[PDB]
Amino acid sequence: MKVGIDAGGTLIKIVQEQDNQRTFKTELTKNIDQVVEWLNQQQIEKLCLTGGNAGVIAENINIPAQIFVEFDAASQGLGILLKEQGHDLADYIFANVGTGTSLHYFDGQSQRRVGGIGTGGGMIQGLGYLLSQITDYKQLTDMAQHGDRNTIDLKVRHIYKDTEPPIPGDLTAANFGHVLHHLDADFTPSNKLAAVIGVVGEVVTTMAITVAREFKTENIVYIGSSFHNNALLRKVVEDYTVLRGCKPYYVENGAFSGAIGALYL
Amino acid sequence: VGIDAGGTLIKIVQERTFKTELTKNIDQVVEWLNQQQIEKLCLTGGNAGVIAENINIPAQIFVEFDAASQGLGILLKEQGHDLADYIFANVGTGTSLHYFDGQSQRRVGGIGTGGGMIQGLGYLLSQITDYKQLTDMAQHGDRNTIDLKVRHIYKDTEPPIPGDLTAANFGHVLHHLDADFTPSNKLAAVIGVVGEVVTTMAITVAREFKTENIVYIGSSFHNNALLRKVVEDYTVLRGCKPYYVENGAFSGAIGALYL
Numbered sequence: 154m155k156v157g158i159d160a161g162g163t164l165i166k167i168v169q170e171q172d173n174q175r176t177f178k179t180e181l182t183k184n185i186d187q188v189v190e191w192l193n194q195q196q197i198e199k200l201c202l203t204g205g206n207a208g209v210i211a212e213n214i215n216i217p218a219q220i221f222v223e224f225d226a227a228s229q230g231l232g233i234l235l236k237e238q239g240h241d242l243a244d245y246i247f248a249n250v251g252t253g254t255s256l257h258y259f260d261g262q263s264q265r266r267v268g269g270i271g272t273g274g275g276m277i278q279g280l281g282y283l284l285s286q287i288t289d290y291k292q293l294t295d296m297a298q299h300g301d302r303n304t305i306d307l308k309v310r311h312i313y314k315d316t317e318p319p320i321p322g323d324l325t326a327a328n329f330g331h332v333l334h335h336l337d338a339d340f341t342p343s344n345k346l347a348a349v350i351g352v353v354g355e356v357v358t359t360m361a362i363t364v365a366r367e368f369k370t371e372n373i374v375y376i377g378s379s380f381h382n383n384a385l386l387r388k389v390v391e392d393y394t395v396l397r398g399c400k401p402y403y404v405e406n407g408a409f410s411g412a413i414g415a416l417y418l
Numbered sequence: 419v420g421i422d423a424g425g426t427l428i429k430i431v432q433e434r435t436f437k438t439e440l441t442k443n444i445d446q447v448v449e450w451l452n453q454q455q456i457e458k459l460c461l462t463g464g465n466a467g468v469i470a471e472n473i474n475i476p477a478q479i480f481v482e483f484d485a486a487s488q489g490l491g492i493l494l495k496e497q498g499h500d501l502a503d504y505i506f507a508n509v510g511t512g513t514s515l516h517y518f519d520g521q522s523q524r525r526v527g528g529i530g531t532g533g534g535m536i537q538g539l540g541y542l543l544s545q546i547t548d549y550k551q552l553t554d555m556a557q558h559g560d561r562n563t564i565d566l567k568v569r570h571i572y573k574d575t576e577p578p579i580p581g582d583l584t585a586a587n588f589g590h591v592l593h594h595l596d597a598d599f600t601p602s603n604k605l606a607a608v609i610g611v612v613g614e615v616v617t618t619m620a621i622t623v624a625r626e627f628k629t630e631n632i633v634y635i636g637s638s639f640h641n642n643a644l645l646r647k648v649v650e651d652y653t654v655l656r657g658c659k660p661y662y663v664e665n666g667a668f669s670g671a672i673g674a675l676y677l
């Protein structure tokens with residue numbers, strides 16, 4: 154078989170292609186050892202690698218392998234996944250929301266990195282843990298769905314009281330801006346985790362909508378594993394993308410865009 | 419008098435005299451204003467109305483964006499800068515980003531990462547409510563065990579962007595579980611992430627509007643050298659030219675008076 158692997162900061166994504174039956178496999182990066190041992194016992198017609206931990210794999214394998222830059226690979230797998238799923242977009246921003254976040258403009262032909270920020274899945278896990286002691290990703294993201302952000306976040310209408318503001322009053326003005334206004338109140342693990350995802354969702358969208366306006370597209374494709382088991386994040390991202398007059402897109406297996414692309418380059 | 423009554427701080431300029439007062443003590447500002455009559459009064463900010471209705475004299479009310487820009491242009495001239503164009507980034511309770519073309523300003527975006535987040539998230543990670551103690555507590559914090567750089571993700575590989583870049587704020591926490599995340603380290607990371615998001619937003623609209631100049635203002639920079647260093651280093655790293663300005667947090671109040 155043919156196998157493509159995007160070995161990221163947190164997750165290793167593997168796709169095997171047989172003929173036209175894909176297999177999508179996720180493993181932890183910390184169990185990268187167990188991906189190598191597994192790889193060495195497969196019969197592999199072609200192997201392709203990308204991501205930060207690609208070299209760790211290449212060196213520990215007894216089989217040659219091509220290595221591609223993850224920006225190029227993500228773009229290539231995303232284009233394939235968008236066609237398959239019936240989106241024919243002339244151009245778009247894509248925002249890869251992984252351990253960290255990378256923002257790309259795809260003009261129709263190629264991708265170009267137009268920015269990035271360290272607000273993404275790693276912040277959700279890291280800051281999440283600092284605010285809740287919860288290490289289990291499932292527990293963390295499940296708990297955050299039940300959360301309320303009202304006592305934590307400060308909207309524009311709170312700063313502008315009775316009077317009429319110069320931007321929409323419902324907008325978030327200050328993430329964690331209301332904490333000092335509602336001391337006494339507990340601040341529950343749910344509420345705080347919702348606010349973390351809230352701030353991460355909002356920064357990514359802001360960057361994406363800004364860059365979208367810069368390169369003159371209304372299409373914003375969001376990918377990365379950060380969106381798995383995290384409805385709040387997609388909602389946050391999606392509502393605000395629409396609110397700013399852009400069109401958000403999520404993609405089935407969009408978090409495997411790198412591993413697929415590695416196979417088709 | 420010119421006043422910019424923000425979400426957190428009320429900034430007063432008497433014509434120059436520069437006085438700051440907490441927004442939660444707005445009651446005392448009215449009390450103070452009424453007790454001494456004034457030739458002309460101008461107002462701006464979110465809490466301009468709360469003042470206007472609790473006061474005697476017909477003080478004009480301006481949009482804070484237009485005022486901030488008018489005051490900043492004046493502060494820049496007084497402090498020897500002659501910039502043809504620039505972005506300015508008003509880092510207040512939240513953050514508002516503006517492109518000034520040489521003639522007028524335009525709001526080009528904003529984000530809720532700023533001083534309100536430094537205070538709020540800061541409290542949630544340290545229990546510290548005093549602004550001066552918190553920002554001091556952060557100054558010599560160490561981010562190594564909290565933040566994840568590009569070179570950490572790209573251990574065996576050559577990275578496609580500079581390895582010293584921050585990759586994931588707080589993204590090292592799970593890699594340093596049996597360790598004490600001290601209040602200083604954690605407060606340094608809060609300021610770290612706030613400073614980086616504001617810079618990224620700033621440099622992006624700077625590229626968009628074809629200007630290399632980025633003027634940073636707001637009171638988020640008072641008593642926070644780390645925030646300035648963070649904003650400044652990375653602005654320079656992205657080929658843009660950062661500027662701070664004396665009393666730049668009073669830009670709105672000054673601008674209210676000139677308009």
Ligand SMILES: Nc1ncnc2c1ncn2[C@@H]1O[C@H](COP(=O)(O)OP(=O)(O)O)[C@@H](O)[C@H]1O
Nearest residue numbers: 161162163164251252274275290377378379381
């Ligand atoms: N099973 C899981 N374990 C840990 N994190 C997960 C899991 N599923 C989703 N995530 C989220 O996805 C993020 C990393 O996703 P990914 O897009 O694969 O980045 P990378 O390419 O760096 O591995 C994590 O930081 C976390 O927020």
Ligand SMILES: Nc1ncnc2c1ncn2[C@@H]1O[C@H](COP(=O)(O)OP(=O)(O)O)[C@@H](O)[C@H]1O
Nearest residue numbers: 424425426427510511533534549636637638640
């Ligand atoms: N003495 C202080 N007390 C509280 N916060 C302060 C103080 N000095 C500086 N700050 C910081 O500056 C922010 C206020 O910036 P500013 O431009 O005055 O915002 P606003 O216009 O919303 O009042 C606060 O959220 C806080 O981060």
Ligand SMILES: COCCCCCNC(=O)CCNC(=O)[C@H](O)C(C)(C)COP(=O)(O)O
Nearest residue numbers: 161162251252253254255269270583584585
């Ligand atoms: C001092 O550093 C200032 C940093 C300013 C913020 C800029 N940071 C960045 O653009 C890097 C953000 N992260 C990313 O682009 C990604 O995480 C990558 C480093 C490409 C790794 O990809 P993944 O492992 O898939 O997250």
Ligand SMILES: COCCCCCNC(=O)CCNC(=O)[C@H](O)C(C)(C)COP(=O)(O)O
Nearest residue numbers: 324325326424425510511512513514528529
């Ligand atoms: C629900 O919306 C989700 C996220 C929207 C984020 C965009 N938010 C913004 O552009 C507003 C951010 N805040 C600001 O621009 C400022 O804080 C202002 C509201 C202008 C007030 O100024 P000050 O009181 O001086 O901070």
Ligand SMILES: [Mg+2]
Nearest residue numbers: 159161162251
């Ligand atoms: Mg990745």
Ligand SMILES: [Mg+2]
Nearest residue numbers: 424463510670
């Ligand atoms: Mg202000």
